Amino acid sequence: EKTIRIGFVGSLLFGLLPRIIHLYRQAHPNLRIELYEMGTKAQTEALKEGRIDAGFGRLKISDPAIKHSLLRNERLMVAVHASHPLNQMKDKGVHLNDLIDEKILLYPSSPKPNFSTHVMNIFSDHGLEPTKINEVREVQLALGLVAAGEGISLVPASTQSIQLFNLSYVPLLDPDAITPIYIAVRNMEESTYIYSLYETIRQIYAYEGFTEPPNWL
Amino acid sequence: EKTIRIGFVGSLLFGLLPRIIHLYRQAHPNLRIELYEMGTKAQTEALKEGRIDAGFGRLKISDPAIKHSLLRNERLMVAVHASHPLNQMKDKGVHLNDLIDEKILLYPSSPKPNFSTHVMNIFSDHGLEPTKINEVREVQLALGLVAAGEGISLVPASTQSIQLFNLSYVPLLDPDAITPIYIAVRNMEESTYIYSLYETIRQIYAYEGFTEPPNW
Ligand SMILES: [Cl-]
Ligand SMILES: [Cl-]
Ligand SMILES: [Cl-]
């Protein structure tokens, strides 16, 4: 069987994932690559059942039947309307403690734990308690709503692929204001095709100029 | 009390709708604005059932309880990988009949009729039958898949708010390669807040150099 099945959180298409898949396809003309959008939690049973072979997700959910490699962390940004006071710090950055009384749009609306779990945790980690929280379906909706004046949202740096009139991305300076990208696979030896996918990720990351950590992939 | 409820197709947040909503909000400090993401089909029933007061959609479903106003037509474009042959005539543009042997990604997967209905209809309208079609959930899936090398996609021009590495947007030349933007309200709707909403649309459109939408 020359088929590999890859699960991915949809919003990862705003980042390096499409470049990775494009290079992978080029490297493997005889391979059928099937792409399936699914939340990070859903990738656990998909891997266990053999419905996907590798899953690109935004957190690590422990299950004995699967294993994980952290690919990288993205910086979080604060998406704001251009008229917001916070946008005056567009070039400099702000901190989590500048955000606690703002209307924050969280996402996605899929089962917990999800992307938003870590976002709320980094507030809790420093004794900060956001007083105005709303959950919306997914990140590009949150961004559109921010542009419409509905509030602010903490978003991965990769979401800057989306640029909207009077939408601005403000850096978050807290060193832990970051969000992980993981690759998850079955808890067994990776296939030749999955090992090749690892090498493709390495190559794209090298083109981006990322420094590899020790014993990476 | 006092509240206005606005239904909208999610992808319309990539165009002028947010700045319309924001300008409108500024003019009404006492107004609660509730925004609801929903497909154009759902807006019709939501309007008849009183769950929204105005719907911004991408097609017209005729119903005697609803009245529509065509705000404008967006040009359709072809999203392609940078290396695609179609991307060699981005300046001059291509026609629908140039797309027929390509793998076309349709969207969204919401109930029909939807954006993809008109897309397939404009091909059918000229005796063109795309030989390879696949439906995906919504526009960003299509764009990512195009960027990943899986095919091409027809998208509204406002989609260009999303820029991906090696993703290019090619104009279409067919005069009917367009997609409408409608506002829909209940037939006997005469609220001052709805009047104000239409005037806000008018002001935003005027500033962009567009034609004034139809009369109240
Ligand atoms: Cl998301
Ligand atoms: Cl628009
Ligand atoms: Cl040309």
From Swiss-Prot, chain A:
One of its GO terms (cellular component) is protein-DNA complex. The keyword Transcription applies. Keywords: Activator, Aromatic hydrocarbons catabolism, DNA-binding, Transcription, Transcription regulation. GO terms for molecular function: DNA binding; DNA-binding transcription factor activity. The keyword Ligase does not apply. Cis,cis-muconate binds at residues 11, 40, 115. Signal peptide: none annotated. Benzoate 2 binds at residues 16, 56, 72, 114, 205. Positive regulator of the ben and cat genes for benzoate degradation. BenM is necessary for ben gene expression but not for expression of the cat genes, which can be regulated by CatM. Binds to the inducers cis,cis-muconate and benzoate. Contains a secondary binding site for benzoate in addition to a primary effector binding site that can accommodate either cis,cis-muconate or benzoate. The existence of this secondary binding site may explain the synergistic effects of cis,cis-muconate and benzoate. Homotetramer; dimer of dimers. The dimers can also associate to form linear, higher oligomers (in vitro). This is HTH-type transcriptional regulator BenM. The gene is benM. The chain holds residues 89 to 304 of 304 of the full protein.
